[PDB]
Design an enzyme around this catalytic site. Sequence first.
Site, mmCIF file in Angstrom:
data_model
loop_
_atom_site.group_PDB
_atom_site.id
_atom_site.type_symbol
_atom_site.label_atom_id
_atom_site.label_comp_id
_atom_site.label_asym_id
_atom_site.label_seq_id
_atom_site.Cartn_x
_atom_site.Cartn_y
_atom_site.Cartn_z
ATOM 1 N N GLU A 195 -6.899 2.836 -35.450
ATOM 2 C CA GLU A 195 -5.522 2.990 -34.925
ATOM 3 C C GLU A 195 -4.570 2.421 -35.988
ATOM 4 O O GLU A 195 -3.697 3.178 -36.453
ATOM 5 C CB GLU A 195 -5.384 2.157 -33.583
ATOM 6 C CG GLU A 195 -6.286 2.990 -32.574
ATOM 7 C CD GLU A 195 -5.838 2.703 -31.157
ATOM 8 O OE1 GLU A 195 -5.744 1.553 -30.768
ATOM 9 O OE2 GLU A 195 -5.632 3.736 -30.509
ATOM 10 N N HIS A 215 -11.387 -3.702 -30.911
ATOM 11 C CA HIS A 215 -10.349 -4.575 -30.332
ATOM 12 C C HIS A 215 -10.970 -5.648 -29.431
ATOM 13 O O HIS A 215 -11.677 -5.175 -28.501
ATOM 14 C CB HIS A 215 -9.296 -3.766 -29.548
ATOM 15 C CG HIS A 215 -8.493 -2.803 -30.416
ATOM 16 N ND1 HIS A 215 -7.756 -1.750 -29.939
ATOM 17 C CD2 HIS A 215 -8.280 -2.843 -31.747
ATOM 18 C CE1 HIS A 215 -7.114 -1.196 -30.958
ATOM 19 N NE2 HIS A 215 -7.446 -1.810 -32.077
ATOM 20 N N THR A 249 -2.452 -0.113 -26.923
ATOM 21 C CA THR A 249 -2.427 1.172 -27.574
ATOM 22 C C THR A 249 -2.808 2.286 -26.607
ATOM 23 O O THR A 249 -2.809 3.460 -27.014
ATOM 24 C CB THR A 249 -3.235 1.177 -28.909
ATOM 25 O OG1 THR A 249 -4.601 1.031 -28.530
ATOM 26 C CG2 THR A 249 -2.776 0.122 -29.980
ATOM 27 N N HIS A 251 -13.506 -3.253 -26.999
ATOM 28 C CA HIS A 251 -13.728 -1.819 -26.980
ATOM 29 C C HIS A 251 -13.457 -1.291 -28.409
ATOM 30 O O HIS A 251 -12.923 -2.091 -29.188
ATOM 31 C CB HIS A 251 -12.946 -0.987 -25.979
ATOM 32 C CG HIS A 251 -11.475 -1.263 -26.166
ATOM 33 N ND1 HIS A 251 -10.829 -2.305 -25.636
ATOM 34 C CD2 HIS A 251 -10.572 -0.524 -26.856
ATOM 35 C CE1 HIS A 251 -9.532 -2.259 -25.999
ATOM 36 N NE2 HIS A 251 -9.374 -1.145 -26.757
ATOM 37 N N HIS A 266 -12.115 6.763 -21.461
ATOM 38 C CA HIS A 266 -11.283 6.771 -22.683
ATOM 39 C C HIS A 266 -11.980 5.993 -23.775
ATOM 40 O O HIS A 266 -11.669 6.300 -24.948
ATOM 41 C CB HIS A 266 -9.831 6.411 -22.585
ATOM 42 C CG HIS A 266 -9.561 5.161 -21.836
ATOM 43 N ND1 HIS A 266 -9.393 3.934 -22.386
ATOM 44 C CD2 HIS A 266 -9.406 4.998 -20.504
ATOM 45 C CE1 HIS A 266 -9.118 3.035 -21.459
ATOM 46 N NE2 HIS A 266 -9.149 3.652 -20.306
ATOM 47 N N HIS A 296 -12.265 2.260 -30.983
ATOM 48 C CA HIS A 296 -11.543 3.550 -31.151
ATOM 49 C C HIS A 296 -12.273 4.231 -32.363
ATOM 50 O O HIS A 296 -12.542 3.456 -33.298
ATOM 51 C CB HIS A 296 -10.049 3.484 -31.439
ATOM 52 C CG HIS A 296 -9.353 2.750 -30.303
ATOM 53 N ND1 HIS A 296 -8.762 3.417 -29.264
ATOM 54 C CD2 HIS A 296 -9.202 1.459 -30.061
ATOM 55 C CE1 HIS A 296 -8.288 2.542 -28.411
ATOM 56 N NE2 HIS A 296 -8.596 1.336 -28.860
#
Length: 258
Positions: free
Chosen positions: A104, A117, A196, A92, A62, A94
Amino acid sequence: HHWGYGKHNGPEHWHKDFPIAKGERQSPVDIDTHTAKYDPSLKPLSVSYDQATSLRILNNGHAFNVEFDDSQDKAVLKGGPLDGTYRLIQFHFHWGSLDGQGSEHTVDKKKYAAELHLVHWNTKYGDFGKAVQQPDGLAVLGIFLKVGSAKPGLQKVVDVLDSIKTKGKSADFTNFDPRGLLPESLDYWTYPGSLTTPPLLECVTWIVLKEPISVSSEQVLKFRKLNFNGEGEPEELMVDNWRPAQPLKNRQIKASFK
């Protein structure tokens, strides 16, 4: 089947397996800058990452996580809206399929190219697994990335992605200094929220930095080369692994600055 970011298992379906998806304190949210309340009682953040020990980088299907040794108070966050010390466990990102999407959190509806994050857990709880079951168990520092100039300190990360291309792959990743990912200013917004991704637990105090960091187009390009699938499966590029903004409900966003 199992959750992801596709049409059939995407964020709109998570509630079937994780009912907390429609909870009262879900993240991310849109930060309306004109409605955020300046709170003069919030203290400056304290980031002590000089003793940080990175260990490994992993493709979990992911995103990619850089993991740190959290067996002692080596890299911690304190101050801000927090009581107690929070140890860094992993960071990590996104990101999007295009430069106009990927974060996000959004600022006045503006989406950034990516969002970093830095995940921390409250030491009073003894371990990460116990911290996620508490309302104040985690503190996440969110930093937006915009495309512009290259970020020198991110290059070591970019260069090891080829080696963890598919799900389940990992690589030794020692001596990485996360101080190279911080903007110049530590001014922030803060609100009570959740993880999230599943299990979406409402155990996070979010600390969102106002100032984005810049990365080059080429740096972000390498993130988009990763895969969701495992080795020897049909290729699905790892892009758009962001959850859209959730209703604020009964919550207030506070600002550390005016």
